[PDB]
Each structure stands twice: as structure tokens, then as C-alpha cells.
Paper text:
The human type 1 insulin-like growth factor receptor (IGF-1R) is a disulfide-linked homodimeric member of the receptor tyrosine kinase family (Ullrich et al., 1986, Lemmon and Schlessinger, 2010) that signals into Ras/ERK or PI3K/Akt pathways in response to activation by the insulin-like growth factors I and II (IGF-I and IGF-II) (Adams et al., 2000, Denley et al., 2005, Riedemann and Macaulay, 2006, Laviola et al., 2007, Tao et al., 2007). IGF-1R signaling is involved in normal human growth and development (Denley et al., 2005) and in maintenance of neuroplasticity (Dyer et al., 2016). Despite these advances, there is currently no three-dimensional (3D) structure of IGF-II bound to IGF-1R or to IR-A. To begin to address this shortcoming, we present here single-particle cryo-EM structures of IGF-II bound to the intact ectodomain of IGF-1R.
The head regions of open- and closed-leg structures are effectively identical in structure; hence, the description of the head region that follows will be limited to that seen in the open-leg structure, as its associated map (MapHO) is of higher resolution than that of the closed-leg structure (MapHC). The salient features of the head region of IGF-II.IGF-1Rzip are as follows.(1) A single IGF-II molecule is seen bound within the head region, interacting with receptor domains L1, L2, αCT′, and FnIII-1′. IGF-II binding results further in a repositioning and reconfiguring of the αCT′ segment on the surface of domain L1, with the αCT′ segment threading through the polypeptide loop formed by the IGF-II C domain (residues 33–40) and the growth factor helical core. In particular, the segment of the C domain of IGF-II that is most distal to growth factor core (namely, IGF-II residues 33–36) is disordered, as are the adjacent receptor CR domain residues 258–265. The IGF-II C domain is four residues shorter than that of IGF-I and lacks an aromatic counterpart to IGF-I Tyr31; the IGF-II C domain thus appears too short to form intimate contact with the receptor CR domain. However, the C domain of IGF-II has an arginine at position 40 (threonine in IGF-I) that is stabilized both by (i) a salt bridge with IGF-II residue Glu45 that lies near the N terminus of the first helix of the IGF-II A domain, and by (ii) a polar interaction with the side chain of the adjacent IGF-II residue Ser39.
Author numbering:
A (entry chain I): 5 to 32, 37 to 62
B (entry chain B): 299 to 511, 518 to 578, 673 to 705
C (entry chain A): 1 to 155, 161 to 257, 266 to 293, 299 to 457
Write the structure that this text describes.
Amino acid sequence: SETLCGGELVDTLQFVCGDRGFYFSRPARRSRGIVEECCFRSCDLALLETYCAT
Amino acid sequence: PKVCEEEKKTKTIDSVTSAQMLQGCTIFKGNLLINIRRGNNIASELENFMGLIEVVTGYVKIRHSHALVSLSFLKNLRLILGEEQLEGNYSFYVLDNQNLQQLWDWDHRNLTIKAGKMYFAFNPKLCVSEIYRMEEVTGTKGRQSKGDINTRNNGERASCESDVLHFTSTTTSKNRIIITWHRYRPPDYRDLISFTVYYKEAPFKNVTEYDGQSWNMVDVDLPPNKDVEPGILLHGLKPWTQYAVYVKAVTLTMVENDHIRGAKSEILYIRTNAPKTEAEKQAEKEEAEYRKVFENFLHNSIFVPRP
Amino acid sequence: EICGPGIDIRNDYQQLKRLENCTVIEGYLHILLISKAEDYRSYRFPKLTVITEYLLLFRVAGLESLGDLFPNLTVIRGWKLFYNYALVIFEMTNLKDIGLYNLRNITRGAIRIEKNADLCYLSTVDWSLILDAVSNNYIVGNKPPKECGDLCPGTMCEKTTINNEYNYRCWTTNRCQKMCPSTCGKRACTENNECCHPECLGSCSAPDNDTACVACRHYYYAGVCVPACPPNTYRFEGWRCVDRDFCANILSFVIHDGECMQECPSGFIRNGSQSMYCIPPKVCEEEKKTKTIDSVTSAQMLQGCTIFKGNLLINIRRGNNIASELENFMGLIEVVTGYVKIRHSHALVSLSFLKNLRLILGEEQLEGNYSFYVLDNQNLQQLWDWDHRNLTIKAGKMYFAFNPKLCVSEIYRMEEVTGTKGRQSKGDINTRNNGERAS
Ligand SMILES: *[C@@H]1O[C@H](CO)[C@@H](O)[C@H](O)[C@H]1NC(C)=O
Ligand SMILES: *[C@@H]1O[C@H](CO)[C@@H](O)[C@H](O)[C@H]1NC(C)=O
Ligand SMILES: *[C@@H]1O[C@H](CO)[C@@H](O)[C@H](O)[C@H]1NC(C)=O
Ligand SMILES: *[C@@H]1O[C@H](CO)[C@@H](O)[C@H](O)[C@H]1NC(C)=O
């Protein structure tokens, strides 16, 4: 992998999370958006797994 | 042989009809001050009225001449003497040309700038690869500083980086051609708005993209069967004629202008066997940017990392 | 039945059971990333009637119309917006018709509806009855129009004209869009066209009665809609007045100027634990090092700031009235440190909305030491009413290029207002790229 931004990003997040699904709880404070990791700088499938619920 | 000496030293040139005095001549025993702010068709006619000028016994100055994308209308010019020269000893000078894309075609146009140096400023599309090759080719490499050929304002706008679009397949026909190129995508595919393909008749393999503006432009997008290779059919062809064809990717511009390279093919020369609107030009660029930024904001907002 | 805080629903349709009791959502609603397409109209919610912030839907698979799920959704107030939008419907892979057949006003903000590859019946809605500033609505990427196949009652729905398209208007194949007769003037109306109370929104249970309003035009209190907040009570966010003791009892607020605020404005201080009053420099700062301003939501983070001790990037592509709204969120900023940068901000004709700005401290310059830097902006015909400003850039230097409408006299006039005199080069403030298309 290198960088992902559009439909590719949500599709590979769904693929890696699968049925466990996504985490959410509104902050409030933030580090940086998922795009500033996986699109602009460098993506990692070890990080995409951390937006999943588990 | 025919000389072009004139009662003015500085033959300013504001129009095609101002060059008339030069029509059919070679050696201009003076200096020039080109100031062609606006016009059209001019290159096809200056190449008649002054496309034989071969030697200039002085400086050349080129100022505010936004009307022309290239100097290649000086088809024949082999030599600048600089026997008369500007303050700061500039004997070639190119200033504030809002749209100057290239100088002469350094693949076969030789030249020399004998007795002086040169200055470039504010020409925003004339990127340095076109002019360092002039320092190399026109006998002037060591004569001037890189404040004279400044890095910052000159060439800022132009996309002078060049990923290459390899032609994956080609198909001649009795009256048609079909060509294909690989699945090029920038680092973030939404930057790619479409491809544009340029084609023209080119009986001799010396042609360049910056002909007078002469090319015919056609557009095609990345296919919806995203696995398949891009490609196009062109029907505007004729028997046995040879065409140049080349493809240029049309891409967004952003703060990533330093990184949205765009792409260009090499020119491929192929012989047959024996419209847009200028508003949607920009409006779909806006539409794709104003979509892309919202989709980024949406992904930044929706996702938050687990414990 | 007032649910809260704002609800986010994701992963599986089983989360939607958390709406069973909601008549009002005092917050946003998200319904997104339901990949599974697992179920259908076992889930339906008669109760849901008002959403005080935006509604967001995204990538909800298997939903075929939104009016199976949310009938009776008479009003979306939009008290906070997503980007500029009180409703968003994005890449809804199967959404056929927008539904919402009983929706009758959207108070704040636009709507964005796009990439919904199968969505139709976006033509047949007369948004001018439901929304104003409809110039902002962005409905571009949906199903192409010839494929849309939009037909409905009569084609018994009233004809209407917008953009000279005089035609029937409707939400779905089954049911019309219907709107009040001008007998009501501004006011709402029932089914069978009985005119509603003046302090009523969307619809009413019965004509002209305090208890009959299903949603309210200003503020709801004690089961009745009212025009204004009663004495000894205080506005909570958006849409209701509340007891002071309630205002003290919510926990993860202060009464100021009659509002139960989350925090007391700049120049005022909370006198201890107080909540019944607050008495006469919100130095707000980093999350990212900079802040970038694409949208009105980007500015909302500043609404209480007045010193912004972080770098600022302005980036505003397009919006029809945000040239004013940003006077609220940003106009109170008096000092910016770091740098100010402004690029591609083609929506701006001026900076005048930064009405209180006074210093650009130059704390964290751009590459090349630029503390103020203005590039590529189309329009931006004028910076400021210079004749009475002060704006000194304490350190670092100005830069200006590609401002096609900015006359350089306005930039050279900055050095009489600003400093930046012996601190520049003519590579920075060039006479060439500025104002060449000016008038
Ligand atoms: C290319 O070669 C032909 C024949 O020598 C000549 O007429 C033409 O001017 C040359 N250059 C271009 C740009 O066509
Ligand atoms: C709805 O209200 C009833 C009665 O208070 C309660 O038992 C039930 O759990 C509530 N459900 C939700 C989803 O709030
Ligand atoms: C929606 O309600 C507000 C407040 O009652 C009103 O100002 C607005 O005009 C209504 N809708 C339209 C389309 O005007
Ligand atoms: C510009 O900024 C750098 C640090 O960013 C500083 O060290 C330098 O003194 C400044 N002045 C220059 C480069 O002329």
C-alpha cells in the first residue's frame, strides 16, 4: 500500500474492519484526520485496523 | 541574401502590420523591441513578414507580449551579435510575457548570443528547463547569474514535471486510428479530471506541441470498467497521411500544485494505411474540487480511532 | 422523548432502536456506514418530528427511500451545520426517492445531495417553499435527468414554477408535495388547508391554538410554542427555554444575557460555580498547528475566539453569503499570531469581515519569513477600508502574487498602515501579477 483517499479509503477500511464495524464517540482534542495519514503522508494497515470496533 | 537595415535603430513591433517593413529580409542591422500585447493568427503571418530574419546586430527585447506562446515564428534566426545592448549588458531580454510557453525548439534550432548576456523575469509558464538549455545551446552558459534567470516568478504556474503515458496499444485503419495508454493515476486519483489527446498531420518528424495557438484536441476519461486500459478512436484521418498524436492528462490544481505533476506522452508518429465548452472547462474543475474537499472533510469527521 | 445528545448510528440497523422514544433530537443525527443491507421496514419511526442540527446519511446500504424511515419529519432546524449543510445525503448506494413527504421547512443552511447514483425525484421538489438561500443547494451528481422517470399524482399535485419550470411538484410516486395557500401569508397550514397559528412551523394539529403546533417557529416552552423566552427562564441551545436549575443540572453551563451558554463570552468571567449570571481574551489555539478555513463550520470553532494564537489559512472556494456569516465567527478576532495565508479563496471580494483584526504577530512565519501571504485569489478586489485601520505586522514580511483584481496601490497603501516598509523585496510585491484584470 501507499496512499488512499477516496472510495478506496472507505472500501479498505470496510475490508479490514469487516463485521466488527467502525468505532465512534464524539471528541469533547484531535491529532490529525485519517486523510492526513493515509492520503497525504503514508497509510498503514496496522492503523486502519484501529478505527474498527473491537 | 537581402539586408534589412532601417532608419530606426530600435524597430519596435506592436502588430503584424508593423512588421511589414521587414517582409522579405534577413539581417536586421539594428535592435528589436517586441511589444505584441494582443492579436490572433499573428504567428502564421510574422513567419512571413519576419520568419526569414537571420541575424540581429544588437539586442532583442520582448516585453508584455502576452499574445504569443512561442518565439518559433523567428524560424530562421541563427545569430545575435549584441553589437548594441541594454543597460546591464543584456542583449536578450524577455519580460512579463504572461503566456510564453517555450522558446525556439532546442531539438534542431541552433543559435548563438555572441556579445552579451540575457535576462528573464515574470514569464510564468516559461519554465527553466526551456532556458537552461538555452544557456547551454546558445553560447552563453557562463555569462549571467541566476538572479538574471530567476527561479521564483518565472515558470511558477507551469506544470513542468512529466510522468509519461506509455502507449499500450495502437491500431491503424483505412480511415481511422485507435490508440490506448496505461492506467495512469496520480497519487490521489480524484485529481485526474480526464485525459486530452492532441493530433495533427505531421509529414515530417520535427513537429512540437507548441505550434501556433493548430493542434486538434479530443478528450477522454478513465473508463468505468476501471480494470480496462484508457483508449480512443479517431475518425478524422485520411489515406496514407502521417499524423503526430500525443496525450496530456488534465488535472486539478491545489496547494498540491507543487505535487500535482500532470503527465505527458512522447509524440508518437503514425500513418494510416494506404466539442467542449470553455465554461465547463473550469466549471467541472470547480465541481470536482468542491466535491473532493467535502469528501475529505466527511472522512475526517466520520472516523475516530478506537481505544 | 427529547433525545440527546446528538446521535451517531453506524455499523448495523439494530442501533436504530435507540430512536424508539425520540420525538425531538436535540443535536445531529448520523445514519451511516450500514454496509449490511440486512433489514428493511420493520424499522419505522412515527415519532421523529424535529432535528435541531443537521441530518447526515452516508453509505447506508439497502435503504430504498428515506420516507419509509422518517415520516412526520416536519422540520430540520440546522442550528449547527455540517459544512454549510443542514441535510447531507451522500453516496447512498440504493436510495431511490428522497421521501420525507411531510418535510415542510429547513431553517438554517443548504442541503447537499450527490453521488446518489439511483436517486430521483430531486427535480420535482420546489425547494423555494422549503428553503431560502436555495442558491446554495448542490444536487449535482445524482441520477442523470433523462433516466430519472419522475411522474406522480395527476401526471392532483399542485403545479408550481421555479426557474420558469412550471410543473407539478412531488416527493414520490405515491404522494405530493403540498404547501400553504397564500391566505396564510407567511404562516403554516394544516392538511385540508386550515391555516395554522402564527407561532407554528411545518404544520399544526389544529388552527391557531397554542397547544396545536407540532413544531415551533422560535422557542418551545412547557408544551406550547411561543415567540420569545419567558421571564425567569433562559434559552437553551437552538429551540427551547429552560429553568435555571435545569441549566445548572446538566453535566458532561452559565446564564449570560438570558442564554444558558456553554461558556461566558470574551471579556466576561464566570463568578465561581454560578449559573444564574456571569459578569464582565478567549485565547484559542491548536488542534492542528494551523487552522484552515474552507467552510462556515471551520469558522464555528472560532466563534468565541478573539485572540487566535495559531496560524491561519483561508481557502474559501464558494458560497453565496458566507462573506457575511464569517463576520460573526471571525469578525471578533483581534490578534492572529503565526502567519496569515490566503489562497484559492475565489469566493472573497474582500477581507472586511475580519472587522476587528489589529495584529499579525509573525510568530511562525512561512518559508521565506512571510508573515502575511496572499496567493492565487481570484476577486479580492479590496483588502480593507484602510482610511481608519491599524494592522501592524510586528515581524516578518508581506507577500502578494496572483491577485488579478487587487490594485497595487492598495498593497503599497498597506505600508502606510502596517509597517513592512524596510522589510520587503520587489520579488514579493510585484507590479505584474496584481490587478491586470482590474477595473
Ligand atoms: C519540419 O520539416 C519540414 C521539411 O524540412 C519543414 O517544412 C518544416 O518547417 C520543419 N519544421 C516544422 C516545425 O514543421
Ligand atoms: C423508551 O422508553 C421506555 C419507558 O421509559 C423504556 O423502557 C425504553 O427502554 C426506552 N427505549 C429507548 C430506546 O430509549
Ligand atoms: C422557514 O422558517 C423560517 C422561520 O419560521 C422562515 O424565516 C422561512 O422563511 C421559512 N421557509 C422559507 C422557505 O422561507
Ligand atoms: C527567517 O526565518 C528563519 C527561521 O524560520 C530565521 O532563522 C531567519 O533568521 C529568518 N530570516 C531570514 C532567513 O532572512
